[PDB]
Amino acid sequence: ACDCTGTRDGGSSSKDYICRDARLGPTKLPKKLPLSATVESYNRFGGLTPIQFLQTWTDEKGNYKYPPQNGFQLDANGNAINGSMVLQVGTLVDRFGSEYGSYVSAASAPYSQRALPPSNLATNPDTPDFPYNYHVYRVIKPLTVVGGPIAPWFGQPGLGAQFFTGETGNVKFLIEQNYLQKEDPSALVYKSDGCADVLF
Amino acid sequence: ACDCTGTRDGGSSSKDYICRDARLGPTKLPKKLPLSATVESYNRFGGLTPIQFLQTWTDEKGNYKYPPQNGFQLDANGNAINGSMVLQVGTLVDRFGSEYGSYVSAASAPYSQRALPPSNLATNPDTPDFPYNYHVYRVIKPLTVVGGPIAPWFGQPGLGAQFFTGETGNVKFLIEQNYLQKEDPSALVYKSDGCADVLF
Numbered sequence: 001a002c003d004c005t006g007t008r009d010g011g012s013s014s015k016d017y018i019c020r021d022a023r024l025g026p027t028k029l030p031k032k033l034p035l036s037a038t039v040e041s042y043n044r045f046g047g048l049t050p051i052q053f054l055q056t057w058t059d060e061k062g063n064y065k066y067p068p069q070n071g072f073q074l075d076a077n078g079n080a081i082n083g084s085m086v087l088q089v090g091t092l093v094d095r096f097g098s099e100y101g102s103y104v105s106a107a108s109a110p111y112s113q114r115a116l117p118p119s120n121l122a123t124n125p126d127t128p129d130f131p132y133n134y135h136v137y138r139v140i141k142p143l144t145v146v147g148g149p150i151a152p153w154f155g156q157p158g159l160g161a162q163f164f165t166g167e168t169g170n171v172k173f174l175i176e177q178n179y180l181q182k183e184d185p186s187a188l189v190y191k192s193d194g195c196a197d198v199l200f
Numbered sequence: 201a202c203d204c205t206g207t208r209d210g211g212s213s214s215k216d217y218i219c220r221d222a223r224l225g226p227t228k229l230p231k232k233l234p235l236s237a238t239v240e241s242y243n244r245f246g247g248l249t250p251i252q253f254l255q256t257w258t259d260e261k262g263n264y265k266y267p268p269q270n271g272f273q274l275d276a277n278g279n280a281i282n283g284s285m286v287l288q289v290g291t292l293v294d295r296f297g298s299e300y301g302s303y304v305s306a307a308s309a310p311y312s313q314r315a316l317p318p319s320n321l322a323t324n325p326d327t328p329d330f331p332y333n334y335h336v337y338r339v340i341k342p343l344t345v346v347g348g349p350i351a352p353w354f355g356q357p358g359l360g361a362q363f364f365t366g367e368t369g370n371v372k373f374l375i376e377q378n379y380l381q382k383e384d385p386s387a388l389v390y391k392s393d394g395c396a397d398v399l400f
């Protein structure tokens with residue numbers, strides 16, 4: 001196939017999205033977000049055609065179906081792999097979504113490892129480096145979270161590290177209570193705190 | 201500081217390594233291995249100077265000190281976060297080291313997430329794309345493993361996903377018994393099984 005069959009044409013207003021269906025993500029990808037590793041290139045459809053991808057990962061209303069037990073990798077017995085762990089100061093976490101949510105992830109994992117639909121890659125044309133709903137935080141006070149591997153989903157390899165913060169509070173609470181600190185991702189790309197190899 | 205003080209000069213034979221000390225990794229890094237994400241550049245010393253890095257992560261003999269409980273992230277109670285999970289067919293795992301070991305990792309995690317010393321980045325000049333001890337496997341038969349997040353170590357963010365295969369066998373056993381399949385990483389960089397965005 002490899003066609004726009006089965007998608008939803010949003011019209012000229014959705015001209016910046018694949019098949020004009022914002023569910024399938026933008027035509028032009030974020031400029032500085034790592035989408036995958038070199039050994040396994042990113043594919044927004046998980047190697048499937050759009051209709052096969054929609055058939056597999058959407059419901060009758062066309063809304064994405066999301067992994068069970070909060071997206072943690074489930075053990076052999078069907079129970080999520082996780083555990084209460086402390087995030088050390090200086091750890092960098094990120095999130096796709098509003099601060100009223102309670103799930104952060106290890107920032108260094110490529111997008112293919114977060115097992116998130118391609119819609120989240122929609123990017124503000126004014127600040128095109130990272131998606132519009134993308135935020136980066138640095139823990140400034142040790143925060144215990146229930147952390148675990150991300151289950152593969154949406155045709156993505158997954159297996160990144162996610163952290164539920166709801167035992168303490170949502171991301172907004174963590175900022176207000178000095179647990180987390182908002183960072184500028186376009187400014188972090190230029191960061192280099194250490195000895196560069198050129199000094200040797 | 202930012203000097204070669206405290207390192208071990210290997211001489212002209214170690215001319216391709218930082219401070220001529222192969223413990224600190226090669227001067228020229230692998231050409232196709234993702235070392236970090238854009239938001240958190242890789243630093244072989246974890247933001248420290250070589251002597252501080254050696255002081256923190258080596259013992260009296262100069263050998264690297266390695267994380268406890270097989271490098272899994274430890275919970276609040278000091279117990280490793282892991283669990284028995286099945287690796288689905290098509291999953292890509294990698295390893296730094298010989299096939300007689302029993303630890304694979306999610307291949308898509310950048311090197312900063314594996315919490316491994318910079319020595320493993322030494323690269324064969326004949327095949328410079330990936331380190332010399334780097335192997336990539338694709339599971340061809342569902343393999344249950346005890347998988348978990350990687351604990352930060354060696355000044356690296358860690359938090360990648362590692363998988364102990366020893367309940368079934370070492371990587372050599374997995375190949376012999378058709379659980380895993382050896383892959384060519386320089387050949388996987390050119391792989392693209394799916395619909396490219398240019399078709400839309």
Ligand SMILES: *[C@@H]1O[C@H](CO)[C@@H](O[C@@H]2O[C@H](CO)[C@@H](O[C@@H]3O[C@H](CO[C@H]4O[C@H](CO)[C@@H](O)[C@H](O)[C@@H]4O)[C@@H](O)[C@H](O[C@H]4O[C@H](CO)[C@@H](O)[C@H](O)[C@@H]4O)[C@@H]3O)[C@H](O)[C@H]2NC(C)=O)[C@H](O)[C@H]1NC(C)=O
Nearest residue numbers: 069070071072075078079080081082083146147148163164
């Ligand atoms: C980290 O991973 C762990 C391990 O899986 C998850 O823990 C599970 O959490 C869910 C939600 O709290 C638990 O499901 C609930 O269990 C109740 C009974 O629990 C006892 O019995 C079971 C027997 O299987 C034991 O495993 C368990 O330890 C307790 O002894 C039920 O009463 C609940 O039913 C209600 O909620 C469900 C929601 O699914 C509704 O469908 C029902 O109608 C009803 O309203 C519920 O099923 C589950 O038992 C926990 N598992 C284990 C092994 O303890 C964590 O949630 C996870 N953490 C994060 C952040 O994802």
Ligand SMILES: *[C@@H]1O[C@H](CO)[C@@H](O[C@@H]2O[C@H](CO)[C@@H](O[C@@H]3O[C@H](CO[C@H]4O[C@H](CO)[C@@H](O)[C@H](O)[C@@H]4O)[C@@H](O)[C@H](O[C@H]4O[C@H](CO)[C@@H](O)[C@H](O)[C@@H]4O)[C@@H]3O)[C@H](O)[C@H]2NC(C)=O)[C@H](O)[C@H]1NC(C)=O
Nearest residue numbers: 269270271272275278279280281282283346347348363364
């Ligand atoms: C995945 O993560 C789990 C959770 O931590 C790890 O399980 C631990 O594994 C180690 C090694 O097998 C266990 O340590 C051993 O425990 C023995 C007693 O176990 C009972 O009592 C403890 C009380 O704390 C309970 O936690 C446990 O469930 C049992 O009821 C000791 O006899 C052993 O001592 C011997 O070995 C140690 C090695 O450290 C030597 O220092 C000693 O001298 C002695 O020779 C040993 O301590 C540990 O108890 C397990 N933890 C839990 C919570 O069960 C898995 O290992 C990990 N998987 C991987 C692949 O990393």
